[PDB]
Every structure is written in structure tokens, then in C-alpha cells.
Amino acid sequence: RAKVAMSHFEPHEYIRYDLLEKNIDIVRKRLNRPLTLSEKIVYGHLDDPANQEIERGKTYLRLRPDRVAMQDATAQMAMLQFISSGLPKVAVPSTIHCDHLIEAQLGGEKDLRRAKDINQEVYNFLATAGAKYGVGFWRPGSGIIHQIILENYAYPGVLLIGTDSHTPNGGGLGGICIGVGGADAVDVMAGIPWELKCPKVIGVKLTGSLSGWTSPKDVILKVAGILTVKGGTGAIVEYHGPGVDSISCTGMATICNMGAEIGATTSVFPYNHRMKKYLSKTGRADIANLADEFKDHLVPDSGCHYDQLIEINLSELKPHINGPFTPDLAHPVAEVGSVAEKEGWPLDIRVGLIGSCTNSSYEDMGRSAAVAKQALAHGLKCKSQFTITPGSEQIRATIERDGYAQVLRDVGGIVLANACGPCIGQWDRKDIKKGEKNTIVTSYNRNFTGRNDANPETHAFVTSPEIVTALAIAGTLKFNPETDFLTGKDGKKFKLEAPDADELPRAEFDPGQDTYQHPPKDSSGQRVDVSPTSQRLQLLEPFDKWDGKDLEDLQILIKVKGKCTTDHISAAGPWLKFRGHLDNISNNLLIGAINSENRKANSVRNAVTQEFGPVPDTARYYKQHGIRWVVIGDENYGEGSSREHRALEPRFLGGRAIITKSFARIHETNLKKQGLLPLTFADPADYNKIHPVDKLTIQGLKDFAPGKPLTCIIKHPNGTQETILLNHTFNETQIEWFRAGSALNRMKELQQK
Ligand code: SF4
């Protein structure tokens, strides 16, 4: 066909639209129905399109992703498991991005220099394992994983997996980009088929066009309010309609990015001329030209069926701000001042934060600078503190060159390194004490309790970068940029004009400094050294194979009440230090979950000593004494970030099963991967039949089978027993992971020894 390379760094790896077309055509001759766009890309990547069983919401697809991307808080454990597989080189284009371990304190260059010193052991490990196994390495300072991927690696029709739940960001360039745990990335780096439950497809038809203050962020702030955080589970969101041409390519990436907050498998937009324009301005006109020749396969089929349709009229959409402790609590900016007042949310904004991968594009920085130049023209600066995170080095060099960074510095902003920083709590925040109630507004995406600064009483609202800038200047939520007046230095009242800015630089992007490190694909004789006394890195010891017996008289470690995110199960912030060390990070296990017994966090009853204490310590005491335990949870257990640490930590501390009303997708997969049993109540009311003191027996593991429920005997203290049934979503592939002790153990069994 064409020999067009997948990126500038892999001149030999060609895009295979011929393969994609061939597979789409085998599959549509079988289904004889129109295919949505996500169906074309996903089924076009099937390992076996002729025989694969295809039913939305029901079958597991065996897929062949084109490339793997990892960020440094999840890459360490993905690479420690790849190192245990014993395989010599990764089988597909793979990258590591060092963006999660740079703490915001002093701003830019200073914070990067400090991070490089503090994290030297880890950056060393990743660069060395990268050179040895043939993984490309983007150095600290290079940028946030998803911005580097949009700028260099994402293209129409790619199937990309990344160890991060905002990998869907890449849907803004017509690709299917899916968040996974490190063990799924090991499957693909090892060359074995990746499995994904066939998704449902929610269509969102966009009509009209954006105007004035309304920006691409408002479309997904509105969709999250409609669908709620559990509304997109098991589905891909596919944007279509005449209003799509109205959104810039980075705007589409913003909307696809935050679809992670409704639990969606990923989101995607159809190839159109805005993507073509972005590919040409990022050095990839040859890929835009090839995609023009395969355009029919990069847009949905006429009359394709969506399982749910939502219509949004862009012309009527007005600015939104969401939170404070969930991303689906949506409010127009116009009314948040009044709702805050009513609910007792602090009206004064201590810090306004723009950027992160969700909103750090050139157009986002241009629009925020456009609001900031007006305030400056009246002698004002920010009343709130104000920080700016550029998404990559190229965006930092280009907004610097085109003068937007200086406007943002002149209004009182501090430019932070090109890293997650405050978005995952890597922020040395000193202005409030812990427990001090206060309000910050961000252009980020998640706004859950204690995530930006480990303070549970910080009320974080997410909105667009131009609204964070307008509200940082005002310093209060009781300010609506569309209606209200500010007073200049000079005494005159003035109103902020809606920001207008270029979506891409008129000149080319300035690439900034050299930050990519290609693997020697020659040499590769590196020794990865993990010191046996390291506190940050530890080689894995394999988990135990299943004993062949049912699980009797299991102790409940904790019955969790309400929302239990992966930040409740395995907190980030300070714990990021231990992402490569399983025993040390297991000291945060479930310390944020609320115990139904006393409604406290990190205070559970030890069944032996009858002292209430920390959950980590109690799980280690049960493990030390041979007591196998269980977690009982509520709805959407495991919501949020993809960290497989939330599944590895309970396995390590002696857990056996997690029984809930429902699971978020990535956590449920991660639990199966590590040899635990994620089970759901066949009747959710049965959650109320189980009390912290009850012991449980799970029976029927001997004839464990796809579609057959497991029986659970609840043993009450008084001698009463109640039998209930538990469903699971294991297929046969996954039951083998459980029997072997973990998926990695099963893979090492298939290597003939
Ligand atoms: S923590 Fe924030 S900036 Fe970093 S990859 Fe995730 S969403 Fe993006």
C-alpha cells in the first residue's frame, strides 16, 4: 500500500489501513448491518474477524492494538511484571512518559531540577528498562502522556492502549484509545491477543456551533451531568452530527478525555477536516493524506445504530462548572455563585489552576491569555493564586514564543513544569492547613476528595481554562464573566469580552528542547538494576496458585459504604513514591474507604484482638495469622484511575475476593488479572444481609464456569446461615488466570515450564 510511518520516531512501522479495510469487510459481510465508527475501528483490529463472536455488551473480543503508551506512575509495575515474564523485547511500538512524579512547589525549571534529583532511581530504572526491552522514553519535562500522544502518535483509526484512564484523549484524532492496567499492557507488549468486552455504543449528536464563552469542555461537563459517573460504563461514546466541524481537534480531545469520568470504555470523533489540519500542522500531512484515501472507513456508516442517543445543541450550550466532590454535579457558571451560597461551599477561590492534558492546548492557552490581557489592560491581576501547566514542551516553547506565557505571568500566574503536578496531588500546597475548608477551581477533570492536595475539605470545581482565568481575576464564584462587572485601577467598571484566539499557531509549532530517547535497537545489553534494599523499587515474587478448594470462613476486612474510588483504595499524592514497591505501597490499602460499622475512614475492628485500627495493619495481621479475607462494597466499586495497585495490594495482603453491587471496568479487569475474585450480588439487596461480623463461604470454585453463579453461605454468629448467589463475568481465559494465581503466572506456564 502506502508505506506511511506511524510516527517520526518509528520510520519502519507502517500504518495498516489495508488491514483495517480487509477486517471491516470480513466483519460487515457477517453482520450485514451498518457499523458505527467505533465498531469499524475496534472490529477492524480483531485477531480473528472471521470467527470472533460479536455481540455488544456480551462477548469478549480478542484484539490486536497498534501501540502501547505508559506514564511513569504505572510504567514501573508494568515493567516489573514484563521483567518477570522473561520476554526479551516488546512486540509493538511502546513509550514511557515521565509526567507523574514532578511536584509543584517553586514553578517550572526549579521543580523539574528537583524532581530529577529526588526521583533519580526511578527515572534511571525506566530509562534502562526502556533501552533494554525496546521501549521509547520521553524524559521528565517532555510533557503529559496524552498531549505527547496527540502531538506525535495518535492518528485516525489507531487502536492504542495506555496505562492511564485518560488515554481516551486520543479519540480527538479519530482513534480508539483505551485505558488499561499495567498487566493488560504486558499482554500486548508480549504479543498475545488483548481481550475487551464488546462495547455498547452511546451516540451524542452535536448540533449548531459553539459561541462566545462556551468552549469544548462544556460539552463534556454537560454530558457528565446527564449521564452521571456511572452512565457510560461498558460503552464507547461516539460523537457525530453537523456540530462536530465547529470543534477544533484539541477541543475534541478535551471532550473525549473527560468521558473517563462517566466510566465509558473510550470516546471517539469521526475523521474530518479539523483533524486533517491538526495532522498537517504537527508534521503529519502524509498521514492526513493517507487517511483521506481511507476516509470511508474513518467515519460511521450511514444509518448505524446507537444503543442510546443524546443530542446537544452547541448553540444553546452555556458555560458550566462542575463539582464540588464529583465531576457529574453540573452547574452553569451563572448559578454556581448562588448554589454555593445555599450549600455552604466557600465562595472565595484560593487557587485557580489551568492546564493538565484535558486543557493545555495552544488554543486553551490562547483563550486564557485573551481573558488575562483584558484584566491587565485595566490594571488588574489575579485575586486568587493562579498556576499554569503546559501539556508538553512543544506547547511551552510555542506559547512562550507567541507571547501567551508572558501575559499569564503578568496577571500573577506561576508556570509549572510540563507534568501532572496538582492534577494527581503532586503539589506542595501550604496556604491552607489540612482540614481547612476552602475552594479551588481547575480546568482539570477529576475533583474527588483529597485528590489535588490531600485535604478532604478542599472543594474543587472543574471548568474550562478561560473561565478559571476569569474567576481567578475575580477571586469569587459569585462572578459570572458573561454578565458581571469588574472595576479597573482607574475606577471604571468594565466587562470581560468573550475570548477569541487562534486554534493552532500561525507559524509552525516550536518543538522546544530534545526530550525523546530512542532505544538502541542494536546494542540492548543493559542490565536493569533494582537494589534489594530499595525503598522505591522491588522485584515481584509470584502469587500462589489456587489450592483447588472452596473459600471457607472468610473474614470481612471491611464492608464499605457508598463511593469507593481507586484513590480510596490506593491513594496517590505521597504514595506515588512507592509505585514500584508493592510491600511499601500496600500500607495505604483502603485507608480512604468509609467503614459502614462506624462510618470512619481507616478504622476497622480486628476480629481477634477487638481493637479498632488501621485497615493495612489489620490485613497484615490476618495474613500473618492465616485468616483469608474479603471486601464487601457498594455500587461502582473501583471508580476512577486505572492503577492496578488497587488490585495488587489486596492480593498481597491476603485478600481473596471483593463482592460488590457493581464494578468499574478497569478495576474489575485488574482484580481478575491478579488472581482475585470480583463478584457481584445477584440481588443487590443482599448487601444488607451481610454484617461486618459474618463469615462467608464461597462455594463452587471446582466447577467455576462462564455464566454460572457462585453460591455464598453467609454464616451469622448466632449460628444462622443464609445462602445467596453471586455473579461474575469471567470467560474461560480469565478462569485460567484465577486457577494459576494470576494472569502473569498463567503466561509463564505457557512458556513450556
Ligand atoms: S493526572 Fe491529570 S494531567 Fe496527569 S495524565 Fe491524568 S488527567 Fe492528565
Topology:
Elements: E1 5-7, E2 10-14, H1 17-31, H2 37-43, E3 60-63, E4 67-71, H3 75-85, E5 94-97, H4 108-118, H5 120-133, E6 136-138, H6 145-152, E7 159-162, E8 176-179, H7 182-190, E9 194-197, E10 200-207, H8 216-227, E11 235-240, H9 249-258, E12 266-268, H10 273-281, H11 285-293, E13 308-313, E14 320-322, E15 330-332, H12 333-343, E16 349-355, H13 362-377, E17 385-389, H14 393-401, H15 404-410, E18 413-415, E19 438-442, E20 458-462, H16 465-474, E21 486-487, E22 493-494, E23 516-517, E24 551-559, H17 566-569, H18 582-585, E25 604-605, E26 612-613, H19 615-624, E27 629-632, H20 645-652, E28 655-660, H21 665-673, E29 677-681, E30 695-699, E31 710-715, E32 721-727, H22 732-740, H23 743-750
Parallel strand pairs: 4-5, 4-7, 5-6, 7-8, 10-11, 10-13, 11-12, 16-17, 16-19, 17-18, 19-20, 24-27, 27-28, 28-29
Antiparallel strand pairs: 1-2, 3-9, 6-23, 14-15, 21-22, 24-30, 25-26, 29-32, 30-31, 31-32
Bound molecules: iron/sulfur cluster.
PDB class: lyase(carbon-oxygen)
Keywords: lyase(carbon-oxygen)
Assembly: monomeric
Structure commentary:
InterPro entries: Acnase/IPM_dHydase_lsu_aba_1/3, Acoase/IPM_deHydtase_lsu_aba, Aconitase/3IPM_dehydase_swvl, Aconitase/IPM_isomerase, Aconitase_4Fe-4S_BS, Aconitase_4Fe-4S_dom, Aconitase_dom2, Aconitase_mito-like. This protein is an alpha/beta fold and 753 residues long. It folds into four domains: 1-201, Aconitase, domain 3, CATH 3.30.499; 202-314, Aconitase, Domain 2 (3-Layer(aba) Sandwich), CATH 3.40.1060; 315-489, 2-Layer Sandwich (Aconitase, domain 3); 533-753, Alpha-Beta Barrel (Aconitase, domain 4), CATH 3.20.19. The chain is built from 23 helices and 32 strands. It starts with a strand and ends with a helix. Bound molecules: iron/sulfur cluster.
